[PDB]
Amino acid sequence: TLSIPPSIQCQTEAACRLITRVTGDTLRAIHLYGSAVAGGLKPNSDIDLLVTICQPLTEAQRATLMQELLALSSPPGASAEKRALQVTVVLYSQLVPWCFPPSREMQFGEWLREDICQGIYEPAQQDWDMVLLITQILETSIPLKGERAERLFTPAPAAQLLKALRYPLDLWQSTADVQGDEYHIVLTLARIWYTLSTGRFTSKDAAADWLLPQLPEDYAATLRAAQREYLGLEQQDWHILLPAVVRFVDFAKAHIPTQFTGHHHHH
Ligand SMILES: CN[C@@H]1[C@H](O[C@H]2[C@H](O[C@H]3[C@H](O)[C@@H](O)[C@H](NC(=N)N)[C@@H](O)[C@@H]3NC(=N)N)O[C@@H](C)[C@]2(O)CO)O[C@@H](CO)[C@H](O)[C@H]1O
Ligand SMILES: Nc1ncnc2c1ncn2[C@@H]1O[C@H](COP(=O)(O)OP(=O)(O)OP(=O)(O)O)[C@@H](O)[C@H]1O
Ligand SMILES: [Ca+2]
Ligand SMILES: [Cl-]
């Protein structure tokens, strides 16, 4: 261990074999990461995969990969036997040596099903979240193909990890920026706050529990509602809660650290 949860082994092997067959000789590695390995696998959770390749895929490779991942993935919650897949593809040359912000070659996920069905695919593009993804994989991941992460990737400088953690925080500003993703944003803000304060990464649920006793009660109530929905215990009316979510976002913007809290950098 680390270990692949038995309940996802079959689908994870099928995804691995598809990605291997389509990418052929450009494939460098495939890593399983996220809550399946780090903890907190819930009924709606996806299976998170990072695919490292040497050269860009042809349009043929990309089209085949997208269409066949549609058949291997299901919408979150539709099935207990066939989960949503999230597959991010990255060029090795964006990570070794690092390019900041790094780009991602391709992204599959269920939120893109309607577009992907019609052959509409996001182009390669810069994404600061890749710094966070590789940082998490260096701590907790399983190589399904290729080498263990610590033999393949190198840590980003703290200065760049700081920028990657604060980029989404600065970008959430208006009601429309958060509508449709209320509990997800509230919980991700708790995770960002936890990482900047401790230098560590933790699950959505554990980050909420870490932050709750530190908040004034009004902000603790919004965080509790987000946590309780994520845990399956009650679905809120987020239209009614939107003004309090906006206040929570602004409180986090005002209070989250602007540099790692040092002896508490990520190591
Ligand atoms: C890349 N992961 C997906 C992606 O996650 C994003 C998410 O991104 C959403 C933004 O938070 C949200 O503000 C934005 N809304 C507006 N621009 N109005 C959403 O569009 C954005 N979602 C998205 N781009 N799919 O929040 C980031 C912290 C993320 O987890 C990084 O991985 O989108 C989520 C749906 O929104 C999916 O559940 C995730 O699987
Ligand atoms: N400090 C942080 N700690 C962890 N993830 C963070 C942090 N800041 C931003 N994120 C980003 O939030 C996303 C978390 O991915 P995802 O929603 O799949 O979560 P998960 O932990 O696997 O839980 P789930 O079981 O709900 O899928 C990633 O894009 C990750 O890089
Ligand atoms: Ca996940
Ligand atoms: Cl778990």
Numbering used by the authors: 2 to 262, 264 to 269
Text of the article:
Aminoglycoside (3″)(9) adenylyltransferase AadA from Salmonella enterica belongs to the ANT(3″)-Ia family and catalyzes the magnesium-dependent O-adenylation of streptomycin and spectinomycin at positions 3″ and 9, respectively. 9 and 10). In the apo state, AadA has a monomeric two-domain structure with the active site located between an N-terminal adenylyltransferase domain and a C-terminal helical domain. We here present crystal structures of wild type (WT) AadA with ATP or ATP and streptomycin and of an active-site mutant in complex with ATP and streptomycin or dihydrostreptomycin.
The structure of AadA(E87Q) with ATP and streptomycin (AadA(E87Q)–ATP–sry) was refined to 1.73-Å resolution, and the structure of AadA(E87Q) with ATP and dihydrostreptomycin (AadA(E87Q)–ATP–dhs) was resolved to 1.4-Å resolution. The overall structure of AadA(E87Q)–ATP–dhs is very similar to AadA–ATP (r.m.s.d. of 0.3 Å over 252 Cα atoms). Dihydrostreptomycin is bound between the two domains of AadA with the C ring sandwiched between the two domains in proximity of ATP, whereas the B- and A rings extend further toward the surface and form their major interactions with the C-terminal domain. The C ring is the site of modification and is situated in proximity of the suggested catalytic base Glu-87 (mutated to glutamine in the structure) with the 3″-hydroxyl situated in the closest position. Furthermore, the ring is also oriented through a hydrogen bond of Asp-182 with the 6″-hydroxyl group and a stacking interaction with Trp-112.
